[PDB]
């Protein structure tokens, strides 16, 4: 249950925590094999820290997403039992908010909204680019209720930066 | 285990080629011919570009006798155009055997 | 940048293989729909006669190796085009060094050795036919690297009927028009379609279309 | 492992149309040259990325633009590099020649196998029946609008029709 | 004197000169005359072959050799290095043709061979190839002419000369060569240049001519060059 | 003499090639490190500002981990290589131990790299000495040094590079504890050290500040000018 | 000084590596190459130094190269080494683009090639390349940039720079006639052509002695182009007319 | 050992010449401390593997022999190790 | 005079057809301390004269159960040769289950020490080894000159001032064969004392004895253990 809702100036994730931040303005949500997921998260976090502090500027959410897709493809390719699904919520200084859906096979896809089916169906029923934070929290609550009928702790990556929001 | 039966067959194709060549020469010519050929190959390989650049290895192919031959390794994947590259000093150290 | 020490190399990459096999196992039971290989399942034929070689490919499957060497193709397509192209380049280099036309024995040896090195994991069931200094030769390449220099040889879909036609209707040292009519008869049996007889002679419902996103980019 | 895309030929105009529902299949491999990767999404993305890497290197070194035939050869080489452990992609290459501006359309294999026609080429899981429908619908000579309708109906029997016209390319997602 | 720098290839002289490469170029300049003229219909690669003795067999090493169906070259300097580089050039051309199914452009082949020579010019343990390649060819309906050096640096040319009296050869080419100059008389111009830079009497077996036009490269037979010599004088 | 090979010794017992690498280090501009309480500073000589130059592209102070940085003196490219490799090592250590590196740790790695490159004739020794400073993790400010020889030494106040003797003697005189009672005091101390080293201040000082729970903060020229104006006011008072 | 220069990996009592210094001298023997940063963009006014009457023009440019969609550079040194160095630049840029799907920031590519050159300087048995490249480009971070690396890998940031022949005079005169934050690409080309006029004393600017490039940003796209023969001729004519007017005013 | 502190600002803790290779093993360094780093590191590694495998204490002679085997490699080092140790255990 | 060009490298012949580096290694072994080796019908005995406060060196070494050696040259190459000998014997007894013959081991060491002399970037092993042993065909006393070529000896001595010991051993070369272990050891001690200056007499802390016998396996005797033999040894 990792529900993400991209918005005008934020990206409200909702983990089941799974929220392993890579750097400022970047938040990666990893789900799958317990051992592989955290190891991959740590590896990518170290790589992005290296890039940040070697170049003086951090990888943008798009660049981080692409690099993570490449690395995840390699990792699955190096060892088959590396079933690791990702959800990279982040904010870009120029681009703005950026949510990124990616399956275990490292198929990156920018997502107006994402989840890792019942949760996605509720988002499909109701979603708007011009959405507010409280509206996204309500959406997450509805998706969680639908999934239960069939946690949701949320953070946002705002232009200010990563924030901790009331757990749902 | 490998990812394919041919994986190791072609990871070490050249190694096996030279091994069989030297075995045959030892059996027929004697000890001197493999020694001489090893010396020439070593001498030509000692001098080339650093590992982080693409060496031509021209004179090595001329000695080997495949300077006018084409194989799938020549065309399929081109080491001259690599997609991931390590640091220069790092790979030179690796080649020297320090790491 | 990091975690890369050994210098680059060239050749086939077998990295995709393991994940590919596991995913095929997954798709086999749920999902299916995996791309397959277009293959040269058609029949090919070839005969050797008095003044050269004649090959048949209903399909074309004939492949230029040298000006005096040609090769039919059966089995898998991409494999056979790549194999024929590589051996053609090798023989072109050999000819450039020689100043002489390449020999059919050289082509047969190259194909045999390369295909045996690949251990028949690439499907190139070929009928190598040409003329050289020695004379007309008709080899029969196999994916695993086995060659037979027979008066007539066939392989493919209807190759057995073509072989029967060759056996019944062949006489030693045919002539030009007789040889290319026997191969046509044998290759015609494989069909039972235009055939590329390669004679290597020694002497020579209005759906609803509602646009949503229309954009232009003047060039 | 879904995804399908086809191409059609016209008069100084060539079309390539893929479907949507959830990944890019129409990557511009040139100013008037596109690609038709169809299959597993991750494989499509990897093939497109590495093909564009090679294409950019080639363009920088040569000083000219990749031609459709040269792009087809490059794609075939790239796919054959991984012959064992094939890429789950069936590139369909459509576009005009940068110099002569002549239509070109082709389809490839999971391992690379050039297949060039001048009427239409289809790729994907349901490619055979789609190509049959195109045959039932295809005609010799098109204008940019007539070409657009033909490929669109064939795909439907949304569709992102990229009619590559030397004057200018047009894109439309139908239904 | 600066002899320590003269001997070593991997050292820069105090002024900043690579003396070993300079000596390789001196070897090139001490080679047999070779004149290449880029005409309008095609190009010419004429040289002064050193097979003037009656014993020297004609069907043997050729000064001008083809790399592809549409590319050929001539050299001035060391024959062995020339032949090895020709083998490498053919290998590279076949690689390009198998990768792209396209004829290797002359410029690309020149780049590849020049980089190969730069490889041995850079590292210590080998010597620069004491030979310069006058590579010609024809692409996209256009004649081409290039000049490679042991340093690995290469330049495009309209008409250039090599070997002995090569500066005089280039002066003569500048005197005679015209931009509109067509083939079948650019051959005459090359013949006259080699005569200006000749030692002995001009015979069809004392020269080796190879032209590359729309059709492609082709080493001229003794009969053809004999006819051209007869037309010249 | 025996100064034409890193391998060979001398009857004195000297490897003159490494001492020449140290001489090249001395050629470099001055770098001044002060180890205070909840503060560490790396004053660097910025005399050759020149014109039409970017101070952002060329700097001596660079970070190695989140809690450690360094400043060097000598061959700029060698220092660049060492800095990049040190960053790689720090991130690898954080990967495998999950906790931030210690200043001593990265100093050890840099010294080990210099020792690796001083082993053989083929590889020349890196001609830069690094003043590596930061906080261990528990909150212990650290100052260290490295040399091409390949050994490291912790320090309380150290100056390297151009005019190192005068600056380090000034630090010997004035380091004390009352000059590290506050971060401003350490900044003034390093600025005065470089004033003894380089003629001008503010525009000729590339100063860096790193507090207990703060990252590398390279002070802007206006702030260093304010600090040196404070030093001048203090001098006028006395 | 006849010692510690046999190898690149050997120091002197003063702590000097004479081999890289001789490589820089070889650079000095090269042809003049200018690079001037400007508000609108950045230019590379190089000296063609291709003045033979039997020389062809079958290439994009001799001095000026293109690295990627966002970068271009000039060369002043040994041509043979510069070719492989530019190939390495292109390859590195494409590697970064493939991995991150974003154009390589100029400083990163400059530093990678400097690592290449200083690695060849570091290890014995390898000759320092002896090529100085004049990089230009644009990126999201620092906008337009102007960099300059040397054989030893030492690279610096610049507003106006020169490498090759009469580099010191060119740089001094640039800083004598350069304004920081005010120069537009127009005035940048004017200053570049003035410097080339007053440095290249071998001959007057004939518009084939000169090879000027331009790198601007139109529609958020880095437009790397080279001044046409007409454009450089216009630059030369404008500079010469302004100089004649100034001489007339002086009287 | 007479540890030499070059300046009053130097930390004597970092210039220590006497080190610990194991609980029951100790040595004092004198000379090229940089190579002594490698020497004592080898000794520490050897005694650690001994404790790991045989769960006992390496003899002083055995650990000094191992680190000597490290030191024998010169002409690894390309020059003789320029430091001496006094393995007092 | 003219040999400076050709006396620095081991892979270069001099105009007089000589490799002076090998001769310099043979001088290095000479500069080492004197040791003695001799065998009886049933025993092979090694006696070595060691170098004040601080312990001495181990000239006598137990390289294998039935093979022992005495060192008279460089310590490093001696250690490497001892390691190689021990490895060879261990491998023989492990795989072939055979006590490695002493002569075979000596031939292996000869080849090992021949390698560097003809190879560049290396120096000849500057050590002389008196290898004692016993197997199959009785005791085996050998001598491996640092120049690869070696010799088999009924009695031998090598080192500094070793010529006196060699002369004394020659005086009684035939007696050693018909001698008891004790008498053989005393003869060895007298040979060692020949090398000592006339003033000095053998003590217990300057003598180590390596003894391998028919039933006995090689053992090194310390001051206390060598005292028995020194007690009774005629002046």
Short mmCIF file of C-alpha atoms in Angstrom, two decimals, chain F residues 1 3-6 17 19-21 23-24 27 50-54 56-58 75-78 80-81 84 117 121-127, chain G residues 3-4 6-15 17 107 111 114-115 118 121-124 142 147 152-155 157-160 175 178 180:
data_model
loop_
_atom_site.label_atom_id
_atom_site.label_comp_id
_atom_site.label_asym_id
_atom_site.label_seq_id
_atom_site.Cartn_x
_atom_site.Cartn_y
_atom_site.Cartn_z
CA UNK F 1 72.33 12.09 -6.34
CA UNK F 3 66.77 11.74 -6.48
CA UNK F 4 65.83 10.23 -9.87
CA UNK F 5 63.78 7.28 -8.61
CA UNK F 6 61.09 6.82 -5.95
CA UNK F 17 61.38 12.19 -4.87
CA UNK F 19 60.59 15.26 -0.50
CA UNK F 20 60.30 16.94 -3.90
CA UNK F 21 56.59 16.15 -3.92
CA UNK F 23 58.39 20.82 -2.04
CA UNK F 24 55.69 21.04 -4.71
CA UNK F 27 54.76 25.70 -3.71
CA UNK F 50 43.29 37.61 -11.13
CA UNK F 51 40.68 39.03 -13.52
CA UNK F 52 37.97 37.41 -15.63
CA UNK F 53 38.20 34.42 -13.29
CA UNK F 54 35.55 32.39 -11.50
CA UNK F 56 33.43 29.04 -7.92
CA UNK F 57 35.31 26.81 -10.37
CA UNK F 58 38.63 26.76 -8.47
CA UNK F 75 49.12 20.32 -7.64
CA UNK F 76 45.47 21.22 -8.18
CA UNK F 77 44.66 18.20 -10.36
CA UNK F 78 46.22 15.75 -7.90
CA UNK F 80 41.06 16.96 -7.36
CA UNK F 81 41.73 13.25 -7.88
CA UNK F 84 37.00 12.55 -5.72
CA UNK F 117 51.29 6.06 -5.28
CA UNK F 121 58.73 4.35 -9.95
CA UNK F 122 55.87 4.08 -12.43
CA UNK F 123 53.49 6.06 -10.23
CA UNK F 124 54.58 9.47 -8.96
CA UNK F 125 53.40 10.57 -5.50
CA UNK F 126 50.41 12.91 -5.30
CA UNK F 127 51.92 16.35 -4.77
CA UNK G 3 67.06 16.46 -15.41
CA UNK G 4 63.75 15.18 -14.04
CA UNK G 6 63.19 11.99 -18.83
CA UNK G 7 59.83 10.77 -17.53
CA UNK G 8 56.57 12.52 -16.77
CA UNK G 9 56.66 10.78 -13.37
CA UNK G 10 59.69 12.47 -11.82
CA UNK G 11 59.95 15.56 -9.62
CA UNK G 12 62.65 18.22 -9.34
CA UNK G 13 64.23 19.77 -6.23
CA UNK G 14 61.89 22.74 -6.62
CA UNK G 15 58.96 20.35 -6.94
CA UNK G 17 57.20 18.46 -13.44
CA UNK G 107 31.97 21.50 -15.68
CA UNK G 111 36.59 17.69 -15.31
CA UNK G 114 40.97 16.81 -17.29
CA UNK G 115 40.98 13.52 -15.39
CA UNK G 118 46.11 14.15 -15.76
CA UNK G 121 50.39 12.69 -16.89
CA UNK G 122 50.32 10.61 -13.70
CA UNK G 123 51.58 7.22 -14.91
CA UNK G 124 54.98 6.46 -16.40
CA UNK G 142 25.27 27.95 -14.35
CA UNK G 147 36.14 26.75 -19.48
CA UNK G 152 48.18 18.79 -16.98
CA UNK G 153 44.41 18.79 -16.35
CA UNK G 154 44.36 22.16 -14.58
CA UNK G 155 41.11 23.84 -15.68
CA UNK G 157 36.60 29.34 -15.13
CA UNK G 158 36.77 32.34 -17.43
CA UNK G 159 34.88 35.33 -18.77
CA UNK G 160 37.37 35.74 -21.62
CA UNK G 175 40.73 42.04 -19.52
CA UNK G 178 36.12 43.45 -21.15
CA UNK G 180 31.74 41.77 -16.51
#
